[PDB]
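so ive been stuck on this for like two days lol. basically i have the seq below and the ligand is magnesium ion, smiles is in there too. i just want the complex predicted, nothing fancy, no docking runs or whatever. if the output looks off dont worry ill sanity check it later, just need somthing to start from for the group meeting slides
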Amino acid sequence: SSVRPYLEECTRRFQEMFDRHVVTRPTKVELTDAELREVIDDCNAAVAPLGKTVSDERWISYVGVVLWSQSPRHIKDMEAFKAVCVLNCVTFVWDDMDPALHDFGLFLPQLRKICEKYYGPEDAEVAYEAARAFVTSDHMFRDSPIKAALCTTSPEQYFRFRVTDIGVDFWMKMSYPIYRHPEFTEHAKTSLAARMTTRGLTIVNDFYSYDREVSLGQITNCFRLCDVSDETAFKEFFQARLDDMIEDIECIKAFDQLTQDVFLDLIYGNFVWTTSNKRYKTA
Amino acid sequence: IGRSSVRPYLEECTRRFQEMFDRHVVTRPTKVELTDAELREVIDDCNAAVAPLGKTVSDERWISYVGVVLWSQSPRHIKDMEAFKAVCVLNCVTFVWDDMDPALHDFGLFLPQLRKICEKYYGPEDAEVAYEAARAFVTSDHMFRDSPIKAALCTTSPEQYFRFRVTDIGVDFWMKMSYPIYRHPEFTEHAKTSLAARMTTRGLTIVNDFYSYDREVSLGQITNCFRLCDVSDETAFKEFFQARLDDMIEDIECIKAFDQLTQDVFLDLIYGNFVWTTSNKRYKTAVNDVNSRIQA
Ligand SMILES: [Mg+2]
Ligand SMILES: [Mg+2]
Ligand SMILES: [Mg+2]
Ligand SMILES: [Mg+2]
Ligand SMILES: [Mg+2]
Ligand SMILES: [Mg+2]
């Protein structure tokens, strides 16, 4: 239906949880003017062969998630940062497109081009494989009987699907070159990093994007597992999702300090971006 | 505590497991038969791969390991016995790693042997996928041997524990080296996203944890979900065991929403592992000459 009856109160509740359990706030990243126009030229060229124009605003609404959800004071590689900017901006376009627009012969080569632009050969393969995996998953699951059984069964089945489908496993495998931290790289490559962060990212996104996706008939959203019309049932479900986030965040705190910073900045950063950006005030 | 145990439940739980498979999976697993030469080629490569680490391991101990691959693949659908033989070797030699003291973990010596196994049996693309998955598994296994992260994810809740096990039990590794056996596009994708590993983690881990609890508590190993409950309390053990059965059943029922070939493979893995586990030397007694701690 719509969660707007709950939008103000739940935002307060999220923020409360972050102030209390994470504390350390994210900060938005500054691109130099050379750096920015690299990113957007690269986005426009990637989508170009698919036939879709993309407004300047829209690229900017996409890129907000990367400007806000990395871990600035750890960043060691801005080419990898622009790689993630470009990969996550075009990832969004592919996500909004009707499947019959999804041309793999044309888009996959641009993904590889991007990865070979910004990464060394080992990382470029890792980033590209994960990009290929994300766009392919998104396509073969559109209105798929598997997606239906994973998103209507239980929260546990749903978040299991979202590890890949929300894009966090992709995120980690294209972001570890930014930090060159051996622990973070291995947890990225086992996908333990993605698994640790999946629920913090997905629960936030599902809440604020519930309106768009119900309007657009999309089922990949954990709040469809409850009756948002029932206010009691929503508030029980919301609290249970809140506890999911809290247990994840406490276990993340057992990771090494650099790794925990990236994980928590990712989760909190995505919350600040998701609320304040125009991508999720409308549809 | 010291010698804590699930021996009192051994009998009823194997029956609860079996009747769960009879109701929900139905198809019985089918053990791959290896001709006598394949079994000797496998074991021949296994020795070579672990030899730089400096421990002899017996044919009896190799064959104990390889039983999981013989029993838990999907012979209805196998197309590539070279990839199958790869999985036998790789799974067998990483079992040794999992059974070793970390002081014996030499990546510089062992990783080359993994790469040679993969290049022997796979084409170019597959060799790289199988190797990254093998390396990630022996690396994760080494690096969590004492980790505070292991203790965090294994003592907080079943959800955190199974999240750790997707990698640690080795099922992501298994999927990413098994997909060339089948040349099935859907299954290949599910392997590469780890969706396949994630769907089968609980069914493999719950079965293995029950039957290896006694070995692991004695060795002081903490990666086992039944440590999250009071197995001495009969009432607490039963609620817990029941909840893990529900976990298995929910996974199996969602697995049936995958295409028919893919779910055949998923269910043969879960059910086959259960047939191997409950009919093999490794899970007959806690310490014996196929599961004993390999030492420095
Ligand atoms: Mg979307
Ligand atoms: Mg989507
Ligand atoms: Mg959404
Ligand atoms: Mg073990
Ligand atoms: Mg293990
Ligand atoms: Mg075990």
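Residues 84 and 175 of chain A are 7 Å apart (CA to CA). The pocket of magnesium ion (ligand 2) is lined by residues A 95, 220 (CB under 6 Å).
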